[PDB]
Symmetry: D4
Subunit: 206 residues, 8 copies
């Protein structure tokens, strides 16, 4: 199938499709990790297909997903990893590593625009169109709608391609090393957020 569903954790069979980079996004009940639980983890290996894993209330374990997230041999790709890395660390205790963030890379090379959302990035870098629902969706439902399923999958289907396009810009425009040091600090940035520094830049004076 185009989208592969899992309850609680990705199957070993489908975890084995990921031999390189893993594209990933989550869905939650909101933007405060300590208040709003993790509901969905969506993955893609780059081949046009997704794994959508439904996370249950109170579930603190996903052994196969956690293994992938922890695996230093496979890069995990987010658009704004700062948040999802924090969600995964709060829920599972796992420090996702290493990571590539297409929003940080966008801010570092697409210096001519202020539009750094994923939709704007995919339209310019790949000519792909994606749509935003309406902001208001209960991702903790019993049964996710099929709309809910394709929204989640479209968040990870293109991150491989987008990473490649942006990587060539960073190298062309000379800031690939800046992006990589940003990627290495990112899990720390996410843990400071969980600790309450989420609205301050630690590198400022205040």
């Amino acid at each position: 199938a185009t989208i592969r569903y899992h309850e609680g954790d990705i199957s070993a069979e489908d975890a084995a499709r990921y031999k390189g980079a893993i594209a990933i996004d989550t869905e939650t009940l909101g933007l405060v990790p300590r208040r709003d639980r993790l509901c969905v983890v969506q993955l893609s290996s780059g081949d046009g297909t997704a794994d959508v894993i439904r996370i249950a209330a109170g579930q603190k374990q996903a052994p196969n997903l956690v293994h992938m997230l922890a695996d230093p041999a496979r890069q995990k790709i987010f658009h704004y990893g700062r948040f999802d890395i924090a969600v995964l660390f709060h829920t599972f205790g796992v420090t996702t590593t290493p990571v590539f963030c297409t929003k940080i890379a966008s801010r570092l090379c697409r210096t001519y625009t202020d539009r750094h959302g994923l939709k704007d990035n995919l339209k310019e870098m790949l000519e792909v169109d994606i749509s935003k629902a309406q902001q208001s969706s209960d991702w903790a439902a019993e049964t996710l709608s099929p709309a809910q399923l394709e929204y989640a999958a479209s968040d990870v289907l293109y991150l491989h391609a987008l990473r490649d396009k942006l990587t060539a810009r960073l190298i062309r425009d000379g800031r690939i090393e800046h992006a990589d040091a940003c990627f290495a600090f990112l899990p720390t940035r996410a843990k400071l957020d969980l600790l309450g520094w989420d609205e301050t830049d630690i590198f400022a004076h205040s």
Copy 2:
């Protein structure tokens, strides 16, 4: 206080060799925009109560012995708020200072009960030391640095070893030494992003 060793242009090879471990360091400039306000002074201590104060001439783009200590991965460099000085040294010399310990990032990560993370209050509370802020900001590119100027420059580095050590023990006690080290590792990139114009935005925010 005191005992200041004064140098013109660069630290002599002899005094550089006094530095067998961490290097305390601050600079003085003509202001806060590196591409506009030139580096005037770099000041250095090895943590024994002495300081090397190197005066930097306008247009000078070379400092062999200082640049070697800055680029030397074996000796840590200690600033209070290194984000600024690392950018100034890269813009002036092409040198990327590394590895660093920043006592202001440390202060923020463990001195969570306070908003005063300047050097003066850090020293007073962590070491029971007084330093004096200059009554008015001064011309650091003056033809002759005053005695008061050399003493103010020196005081910027005389206690950084001892402050690093007390803040490290706090970061260990309160469980954030790893968060701090990750900060120090990113800090040179942070300073390079300043010079390129991202200086008033946090690259990790949405905007």
Copy 3:
């Protein structure tokens, strides 16, 4: 009829339809109770029908309405009760109790959105559409238009259903007790507003 009209007070016959929760909203000349008089009280028992009571200038009495509002055996349901409780206390002297507020409950469980208006709530929680006039309507007119009448009734027709939907979220997501303590403090919050603390949170430092 679908909408039942009253002058000054609800009839005893129509007040008797309310054997459980009373859904309620008001219409006024504006948002300052001491300046802008109460004009309309709209009620619904949950059955698709409304009572719309036209309040006259200077009227400080509505014995049957006031009895319903004061009755601790019947919950009164508002979307943002904070304001209407203050209007009713200023006009009639009545402390409406006990109350359920679908906006407080929305802010407490719909943690994934910032859209907490009634229209947004009804569309997501019940799939119902309602429309906003244009903000500018003289609710003190001689004769209310029939448009004016259905706008007022649509503000109370769904509050029962909406309360039920949101209540199951609060329990699912674990904040029903938080919502109930909010409901108990609400009439105090409204009286502090009438006293001039309306733009400060009393629980802050300032």
Copy 4:
């Protein structure tokens, strides 16, 4: 001043029994974010001019005698701004402190002629008492609390009975004691909503 009874971990069963009515109480932490800054001290007075100062060790999640007084519905708990400390005690111990009287909510509800609702100015005007704010914020997780620290902690609670009583008579005189009681009843929920992340928004506003 004085007479401070010092305890490690929990108040002894004997001193808990001195408390047959209302309990004055404040805490000290490593800062203002409870999930980050641990509880270090809880301080208690029964209103007789003595205080119990209980030092809380890192990671400690249990305090039998203190948690019994906090959860005990028969003895009121008095804080100046209890919204914060109630959240800290719930996060540290799982205990919901109740019932409470908050002298800062009281100050705001009846001291309508002023903007200064801190403890220091409340005490000066209501009781003609001076307390001293620390010259600089301190490390409350220190290995040994100083004498000055124990005296500052104690002063936080020594006058709360007398201040509660004077503010109560003002709330009665000016007709808002009921508004105040309703506040106190909501205050534990208010503190729990803080811990869940609503801490910078008023749940009763539109946004």
Copy 5:
């Protein structure tokens, strides 16, 4: 004709149509009277017809217009008189008196809205539609377009009717005396503006 044109001043014949209230608005080169000159004065007697008077550069005199503006026997009606009274005083030296301001009256009785522009007022109070150009029009042109002419006339054609509608609200809602004291202070408010207090309320502390 529907619109009557004049160069420099209104003719005596057309000034004689005004036996009661005079509705009036101006057009200028912008919103700083000392920088942006007066270009057009538009008038209406209430009968569906307008006089549009083109003011020339540097012209400091319009004897018949000034007589009307100065005449305490005839009320002058503006929507936001504060500005135009200042323009007329700067250009001609004339203190327009007495005045009725449909924007002040709108803010005083239409307490249920924040839309106090003339367009919003005419649509609700009279059901009339008017349109806004695009904000950018050179009112000092050689020859005003016919569009320019009807825009200017539509600013004064309805002020009589609008004044009547709003006056009945003020009396109904009990603030006619508040409105009249506002009208008496208005020319002073405009002269303080010309003196440099234009962005402070003189009745505040600062």
Copy 6:
């Protein structure tokens, strides 16, 4: 200073008759929201160095002799910032005070070289008089007004005649006495619009 005549509820008929011209006047309340903070004191001077200080009891809604002076169109009333006190007297007594002279509107209209338009600085510059702001805001609804309270209340009105006269001569000199009179005429409406809720907006702005 001094000589204060104290009254309970209303000024006696005898002392009212001392007032054959302008009336200086200020009030004291429990705060700045009239519908919440009750009038506690009204203070009056005829400009001879004496003052009448009338204490107002909670709930009192009548003051025959004072309300006659307030409503009396033959004697001008002088406040420093009358916008507030006119609203308080209308809310408490139903009386519209008129006609008024406001020394703060006057100060703003002619003392154009400064931003300090409080009474204290007006008096110091216009009359070379010192008054003292209370060290802390006080409970003006106290059972017994202190001596210090009566002296602070009195000083609010002892110099208003002399300040009115010096500011009038400045308004005449600099050509804005007419602007000032128009202000004074609108000021009661301005205060009534405050009570109705327009208190944080200027009715003459667009919004």
Copy 7:
């Protein structure tokens, strides 16, 4: 052709078309000259045709373009020259002089509007329509799209005409001398920007 392409520098043949004013705009990788390189210089002599010069990475020389920009006998026309003068000085070391800025002139005479963009100016002053892309375009591409080419040319095709229209306003409304002193200070304003005063007005107190 309507648009004439050049690599690196304008040809001598096409530089010779410019016997009077030179209309000019640039395209870059963004708005920080020290970070975002110069990519395109677009020119027009006023005749409906443009020269579009593609600037290569790291190129610090364009001898013929620089000669034109430096030439005090030919006025260079920008819409907001402040930025492009800084880009040209950073890239080439050239102080463009003398200059006429249609945005400064717009702010000085079109005192009745706040719309001082080029699109708004061309629509009112000349009745010409131009369109904005979408803000997000990589001007450093290998091969500029033909869309990219006409966007760049439309930025300079009308500046001659627009300069003439605005110049007659400045003279009519009496501020031509104010505009000319602004034009003389403009290259200094741009160099202060490159030095870090770009977000302060040097003539203020702070």
Copy 8:
């Protein structure tokens, strides 16, 4: 200090002739809006330690000898923040003062290490001179200027030659004298744009 030459209306022809080079100059008004607050005093020094203080009467629109020095292209005029005074002199007399040197634009262009660009701090650091700001802003349109007023007016110009010269040497040293001269050339237009209403916007911004 001192030696002040007082003039009514205009400087006498004799004292004007003392001025054979640059002219230091400041004014005093009734406030910051020229169309509202009239010019009261113009003060002048030739840099020898003396000053001419010319009192300007209300409505006066002519000053032959002063207007000649202001309009005279051979003698530079020195203000600290000339943007304001140039606008006041143009509004009062129709004269465009030129050419000018502005020590505040100079201070901002070379004193890049500080935010304090007032005259007082400029003088203290560049010349080691103290001047005193008036304890309170004064009525400069008084019938008789006090001795203190004439001394404060004079001090505004007594050191402007010496401060111009020290700031010029800094602008030369740090490479911005040309930037400064371009500023001075635009400054009269800048002041004329103030009078026309652009006074709170930078004409070189987008908005």
